[PDB]
Structure 1
Amino acid sequence: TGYDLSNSVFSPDGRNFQVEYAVKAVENGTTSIGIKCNDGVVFAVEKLITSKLLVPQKNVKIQVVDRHIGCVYSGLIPDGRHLVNRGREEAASFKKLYKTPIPIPAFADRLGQYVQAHTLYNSVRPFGVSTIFGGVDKNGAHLYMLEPSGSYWGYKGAATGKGRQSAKAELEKLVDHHPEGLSAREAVKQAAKIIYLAHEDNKEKDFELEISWCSLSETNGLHKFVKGDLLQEAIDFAQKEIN
């Protein structure tokens, strides 16, 4: 034994235990989700209200990269911020050299290679976050989810954090019941419901819902936060479904 004391060491199984321990930090975090709709993507996250003293709507979790990509993550929040900072540098250099905004699959690999690089040496620690991200490019909508190992794939729907099992089951129903697809406005409503349903694994404290979206028709392919009336409408739809 001792194979789990140092990053980048293969165990006799062929496993990197330090990466598996980073996943435990992710599983300990709050629930975050992503839904791919007809012409875009929707992101939503559960924000635990630890105290009344937290200023409502102020501690924003979802982050924008460039102007067309949204990122949300569960686990160690600072690690997620570090990853988004790198993503913003990658997107800037791509646009600097190639003029066009970075395509989502291209952006996915940039994050992937960077996270994977933190599994190659014992002088660094793996990322303690799973990141759900995506947006609209010239080939349409894309949704991705990236793990501490550096592994990522494209998704129809994605979920991570403490209530991921509940969320996944809800996402699977939507995929089955809508083979033709989901509208952006429908996806915002559904995202609100799924976070409310996933909050059962975190039922002790109450929470604040935060939603964002990129849609070709609804936001012109730019990342925007769901605010005011549209947010309240989604909260009402969600509250109606849990009762």
Structure 2
Amino acid sequence: MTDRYSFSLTTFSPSGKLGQIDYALTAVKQGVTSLGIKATNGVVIATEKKSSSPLAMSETLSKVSLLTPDIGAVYSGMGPDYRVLVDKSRKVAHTSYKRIYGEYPPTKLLVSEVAKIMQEATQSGGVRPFGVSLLIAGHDEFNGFSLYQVDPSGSYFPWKATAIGKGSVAAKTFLEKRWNDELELEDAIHIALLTLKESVEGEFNGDTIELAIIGDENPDLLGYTGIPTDKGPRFRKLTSQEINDRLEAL
């Protein structure tokens, strides 16, 4: 009834490769395509709701998760690993930041904390790396809008736009042609839906696509009135109807 795995399960091979990180990246490659695009007045993150059965209620499975009111996340790879990272990411935003400074962390620092958790699974005793790549989109007052990718190694890079998982190579080429520094949020959503259609085989609608934005402040979603400084969450998950409306103008 002992944990005797106090030694690294990820080690350097003779060629200098960290095998378990490479294999975790292979697991991410098999995962469903997700993407992120940064506009001037917002960020969009999107993915396919690959339903394991038609009897399953795919609404209950959230691939796109709120981390803070102004930060959202999506993934490609192993869903369970993602779910626990979201739980830890939400908590670390409070313990290592909000309870100290009285405000939510900026995107880059929350990303840094998630990255740290993933790095530790790559060096600590008796654990495998996380088998996910995250795309984290967010906004804060002093950095503005931003989009980050986080890999199983713990490495993170800021992107203007990117894709991860199944059809990422084709999708990244598609985004390179379409992206410019003068995109509005609606233009980015339109490009996101076009890019995502290429990697999807079957049905393509609001029920089989999950899409969220980091945009304007939503005081209607706040739940209370009477504090001028709290203007509401910038994160908003688009509804099944809101996606279908934009698919008619596609």
Q: If the length of structure 1 is used for normalisation, what is the TM-score?
A: 0.86
For residue 108 of structure 2, what is the aligned residue in structure 1? 105
1:84 to 83, 86, 105: 86
Counterpart in 1 of 2:163? 159
For 1:159 and 1:83, the matched residues in 2 are separated by 19
Aligned length: 226
**Per-residue deviation at 1:191?**
1.0
- Is the CA contact 1:31–1:164 (under 8 Å) kept in the aligned structure 2? yes
1:225 aligns to 2:237 (yes or no) = yes
Counterpart for residue 3 of structure 1 = none
1:211 aligns with 2:245: no
Structure 2 residue aligned with 1:19: 21
Is the 2:49–2:58 Cα contact (8 Å) retained in structure 1? no
In structure 2, C-alpha distance between the alignment counterparts of 1:18 and 1:237, rounded to whole Å: 44
Q: Secondary structure at the match of 2:49?
A: strand
Asked if structure 2 preserves the Cα contact closer than 8 Å seen for 1:7 and 1:19, the reply is no
Deviates more, 1:186-195 or 1:229-238: 229-238
TM-score (norm 2): 0.84
1:132 alignment partner, one of 107, 131, 135: 135
Between 107-116 and 54-63, the greater mean CA deviation after superposition: 54-63
> What's 2:174 paired with?
170
Answering whether residue 197 of structure 2 is matched by residue 193 of structure 1, we say no
RMSD: 1.9
Identity of aligned residues (%): 34
One-letter amino acid matched to 2:32:
T
**CA–CA separation in structure 1 for the residues paired with 2:58 and 2:84:** 24
Shift of 1:99: 1.2
Checking the alignment, whether the CA contact within 8 Å between 1:7 and 1:16 is kept in structure 2 is no
* Unmatched segments (≥5 aa) in structure 2: 1-7, 220-231
SS in structure 2 of the partner of residue 48 of structure 1: coil
Q: For residues 142-175 of structure 1, what are the alpha-carbon distances to aligned partners after superposition, in whole Å with 9 as ceiling and x for unaligned? A: 1000011111110001211111112111111122
In structure 1, what residue type is equivalent to 2:121?
H
Indicate conservation of the 8 Å contact 1:47/1:209, yes or no.
yes
Instruction: Flag the 1:96–1:164 CA change in 2: closer, same or farther, 3 A.
Output: same
Distance (whole Å) between structure 2 residues aligned to residue 85 and residue 58 of structure 1: 16
Match of 2:30 in 1: 28
- 8 A contact 1:22–1:129 mirrored in 2: yes
